[PDB]
């Protein structure tokens, strides 16, 4: 489910083709006001734990804007997850998963880390099934549990002079419906 959500939000770099026409609303706004150099919004997990993560690089005179629109997209998925964005995220999950599982090293990497952790390898029919299982209702369930008013871990590095205090992340982390 978080793979679907972070397929919707995902990543941007300053060296792409076509900025004002990106489907990702965070990407369109960050091109519009010229906020980020790059970001990645993703998952990394260890055994029943891990970091549901996001990482943006930008200039210090634009930090709180990027943080604002990032939390805005997170809470938009928390409350008003409609269908077309879920459809687009499931297409992107298909594409990233299939084109990832390619070659020799990604294949054998998948199988090795699968059978150290699971006890088994996931077949692609399981991936197509667990793509077909998850819709916007599952999205708003998972986003209401995992994001909505949970305590963050913020790693700040560099020119952090504008980067707000932790309590601003807490108070703007949920919505009071604004």
């Amino acid at each position: 489910a978080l793979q679907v959500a972070n397929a919707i939000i995902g990543h941007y770099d300053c060296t792409y083709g076509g900025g004002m026409h990106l489907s990702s609303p965070l990407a369109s706004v960050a091109v519009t006001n010229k906020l980020c150099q790059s970001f990645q919004t993703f998952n990394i997990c260890y055994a029943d734990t891990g970091l549901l993560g996001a990482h943006f690089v930008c200039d210090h005179m634009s930090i709180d804007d990027m943080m604002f629109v990032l939390q805005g997209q997170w809470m938009r998925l928390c409350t008003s997850a409609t269908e077309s964005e879920v459809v687009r995220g499931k297409n992107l999950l298909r594409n990233a998963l299939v084109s990832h599982l390619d070659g020799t090293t990604p294949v054998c990497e998948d199988i090795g880390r699968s059978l150290l952790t699971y006890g088994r390898r996931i077949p692609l029919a399981e991936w197509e099934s667990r793509i077909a299982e998850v819709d916007a209702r599952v999205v708003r369930e998972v986003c209401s549990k995992y994001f909505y008013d949970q305590c963050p871990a913020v790693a700040g590095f560099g020119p952090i002079e504008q980067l707000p205090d932790y309590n601003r992340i807490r108070s703007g982390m949920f919505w009071l419906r604004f």
Binding site: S144, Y148, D149, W175
Partner: protein
């Protein structure tokens, strides 16, 4: 014990607005009864309900 209270009342904002209104009316009724009772208890005797009963 308290997780029930957080899940029912302290997730959404409309749930929180309704629970502070509900607590407002509950606290209203309860605190007015308590204020009346305790205040007549420290002023037993020389209050005009008592002498009104004795009139």
């Amino acid at each position: 014990l308290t997780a029930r209270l957080y899940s029912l009342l302290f997730r959404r904002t409309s749930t929180f607005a309704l629970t502070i209104v509900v607590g407002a009316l509950f606290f209203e009724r309860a605190f007015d009864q308590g204020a009346d009772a305790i205040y007549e208890h420290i002023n037993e005797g020389k209050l005009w309900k008592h002498i009104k009963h004795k009139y």
